[PDB]
């Protein structure tokens, strides 16, 4: 029922880069972040005075 | 002659390491440490056809080679947990001539470890072929009336009727050439049969078919004699023949300084004092030491 306190999100990958010290892989993160828009959460509605 | 199998050997030469003619070469792995000498220096393993080959990879002088007729144990131990890959490690025990050495060696980066597998596989194959390069008395060669073959070989002569000049009464017997082994039962109570290999032949000569041993057998004088000469001259020639074809490419029938001081699997000990009686315990014990006493050695 509540508005979200915002509509951006996150997308997160981990992933691994096998060396020759490690081959199990050095763990890595890297991200983006997505706006998502009013139209997902609002709609056009009647206005008031006060 | 042949000493790659018979004997463990430190700081061997650059020549020495190189593959035996009959030698092959199975399995190599680079990085892996010595330890059992805290030189902490890497180095190269090979599992060759007779032995198991060590060298520095850096300082390649500093070298051990181990042959497969004086192991006792193989023991890979799986350890070095999460913190790294799962590393293995390979304990040899041998005894040489009444000496035991252990050599330890470590894996050091995880991504190779199948090699301390292989190695038991063809020791097994080197111990399961002994009738290959070993010389035997009596053992059990004979089917009901026939020679069981080994895997590689086939009979090539096929004589009744020779006598064996180291008995006097039980000679007349058969007598197989093969291409590996030259063998002769008794054929009567078969279980006089003595099977020669070729490696431990010496010199095959005639003084009446007499074979001498390669000084690992002792000096075995083996004296056979069979109906008129021609057929003996004929077995000889062709015995001579064989026996230098075989030579030049041996078979081994394997199917697929201070540095031995560090080596210690006692710990600075490289001896046996003479066995003697004990009557504390009632078992044959090694003679104690100077002074030392059984019940003073077993407290704490």
Same mark, same amino acid.
């Given at each position: 029922?509540?508005?979200?306190?915002?509509?951006?999100?996150?997308?997160?990958?981990?992933?691994?880069?096998?060396?020759?010290?490690?081959?199990?892989?050095?763990?890595?993160?890297?991200? $983006?972040?997505?706006?998502?828009?009013?139209?997902?959460? $609002?709609?056009?509605?009647?206005?008031?005075?006060? | 002659?042949?000493?790659?199998?018979?004997?463990?050997?430190?700081?061997?030469?650059?020549?020495?390491?190189?593959?035996?003619?009959?030698?092959?070469?199975?399995?190599?792995?680079?990085?892996?440490?010595?330890?059992?000498?805290?030189?902490?220096?890497?180095?190269?393993?090979?599992?060759?056809?007779?032995?198991?080959?060590?060298?520095?990879?850096?300082?390649?002088? &500093?070298?051990?080679?181990?042959?497969?007729?004086?192991?006792? =144990?193989?023991?890979?131990?799986?350890?070095?947990?999460?913190?790294?890959?799962?590393?293995?490690?390979?304990?040899?025990?041998?005894?040489? =001539?009444?000496?035991?050495?252990?050599?330890?060696?470590?894996?050091? &980066?995880?991504?190779?470890?199948?090699?301390?597998?292989?190695?038991?596989?063809?020791?097994?194959?080197?111990?399961?072929?002994?009738?290959?390069?070993?010389?035997?008395?009596?053992?059990?060669?004979?089917?009901?009336?026939?020679?069981?073959?080994?895997?590689?070989?086939?009979?090539?002569?096929?004589? =009744?009727?020779?006598?064996?000049?180291?008995?006097?009464?039980?000679?007349?017997?058969?007598?197989?050439?093969?291409?590996?082994?030259?063998?002769?039962?008794?054929?009567?109570?078969?279980?006089?049969?003595?099977?020669?290999?070729?490696?431990?032949?010496?010199?095959?000569?005639?003084?009446?078919? &007499?074979?001498?041993?390669?000084?690992?057998?002792?000096?075995?004088?083996?004296?056979?004699?069979?109906?008129?000469?021609?057929?003996?001259?004929?077995?000889?020639?062709?015995? =001579?023949?064989?026996?230098?074809?075989?030579?030049?490419?041996?078979?081994?029938?394997?199917?697929?300084?201070?540095?031995?001081?560090?080596?210690?699997?006692?710990?600075?000990?490289?001896?046996?004092?003479?066995?003697?009686?004990?009557?504390?315990?009632?078992?044959?014990?090694?003679?104690?030491?100077?002074?030392?006493?059984?019940?003073?050695?077993?407290?704490?």
């Amino acid at each position: 029922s509540y508005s979200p306190p915002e509509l951006e999100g996150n997308a997160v990958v981990s992933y691994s880069r096998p060396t020759e010290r490690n081959p199990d892989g050095i763990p890595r993160v890297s991200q $983006c972040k997505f706006r998502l828009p009013l139209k997902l959460v $609002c709609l056009p509605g009647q206005p008031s005075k006060t | 002659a042949l000493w790659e199998d018979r004997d463990v050997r430190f700081d061997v030469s650059s020549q020495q390491m190189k593959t035996r003619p009959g030698e092959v070469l199975i399995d190599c792995l680079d990085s892996v440490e010595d330890t059992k000498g805290n030189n902490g220096d890497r180095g190269r393993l090979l599992v060759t056809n007779l032995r198991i080959v060590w060298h520095s990879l850096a300082l390649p002088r &500093v070298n051990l080679s181990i042959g497969y007729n004086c192991i006792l =144990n193989i023991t890979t131990r799986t350890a070095n947990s999460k913190l790294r890959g799962q590393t293995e490690a390979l304990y040899v025990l041998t005894k040489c =001539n009444s000496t035991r050495f252990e050599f330890i060696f470590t894996n050091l &980066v995880p991504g190779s470890p199948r090699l301390y597998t292989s190695l038991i596989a063809v020791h097994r194959a080197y111990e399961t072929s002994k009738m290959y390069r070993d010389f035997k008395l009596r053992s059990a060669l004979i089917q009901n009336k026939q020679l069981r073959l080994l895997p590689q070989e086939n009979v090539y002569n096929k004589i =009744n009727g020779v006598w064996n000049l180291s008995s006097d009464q039980g000679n007349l017997g058969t007598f197989f050439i093969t291409n590996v082994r030259i063998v002769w039962h008794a054929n009567m109570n078969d279980s006089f049969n003595v099977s020669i290999p070729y490696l431990q032949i010496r010199s095959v000569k005639i003084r009446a078919l &007499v074979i001498e041993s390669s000084q690992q057998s002792g000096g075995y004088v083996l004296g056979f004699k069979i109906d008129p000469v021609e057929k003996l001259q004929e077995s000889v020639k062709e015995i =001579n023949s064989l026996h230098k074809v075989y030579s030049a490419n041996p078979i081994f029938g394997v199917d697929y300084t201070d540095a031995f001081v560090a080596y210690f699997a006692d710990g600075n000990k490289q001896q046996d004092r003479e066995p003697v009686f004990s009557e504390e315990l009632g078992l044959a014990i090694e003679k104690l030491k100077d002074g030392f006493t059984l019940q003073g050695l077993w407290e704490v």
